[PDB]
Design a protein around this ligand. Structure first.
Ligand code: NA
Lengths: 21, 150
């Protein structure tokens, strides 16, 4: 519902959080 | 408003001094509602998890803490069924010096350092204390689930 509608927005955030992991 | 002025500063600090393993930004065009992601820290049962959250601010921020919820499925002693988080600094120990960056890193630290005397999820609290073998197995499932979550 919320996660699905904001798929693009969350993927940008996942990529940012992945750096240096 | 003061809240909106403060939230623009929170955002800029995230760009200038990016925290490792976490991220956050306003949803759509609404500064008062943010999306966030926390990676499960390496060396923990939550390792490799890509957990999604929502943060909601009021016009009283930064004098009042925001409400934070996991949207991704979670299994942790201090996280309620609806994704709400029992963390002291988001409730009675809030201070205006804390911001989006510090809130996210505090939640990240809570993942591998649960508080046993605040059993928001009573089964996770019991398994964490008694059967740590079964605790890691239950956490593994929600790690997998966090990858195809959107
Ligand atoms: Na400040």
């Amino acid at each position: 519902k919320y996660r699905k509608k904001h798929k693009s927005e969350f993927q940008l955030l996942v990529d940012q959080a992945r750096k240096g992991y | 408003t003061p809240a909106r002025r403060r939230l623009m500063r929170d955002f800029k600090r995230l760009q200038e001094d990016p925290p490792v393993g976490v991220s956050g930004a306003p949803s759509e065009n609404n500064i008062m509602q943010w999306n966030a992601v926390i990676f499960g820290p390496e060396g923990t049962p939550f390792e490799d998890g890509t957990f999604k959250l929502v943060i909601e601010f009021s016009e009283e921020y930064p004098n009042k803490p925001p409400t934070v919820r996991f949207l991704s499925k979670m299994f942790h002693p201090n996280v309620y069924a609806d994704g709400s988080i029992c963390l002291d600094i988001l409730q009675n120990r809030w201070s205006p010096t804390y911001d989006v960056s510090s809130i996210l890193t505090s939640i990240q630290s809570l993942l591998d350092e649960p508080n046993p005397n605040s059993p928001a999820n009573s089964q996770a609290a019991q398994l964490y204390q008694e059967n740590k073998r079964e605790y890691e197995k239950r956490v593994s499932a929600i790690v997998e689930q966090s990858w195809n979550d959107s």
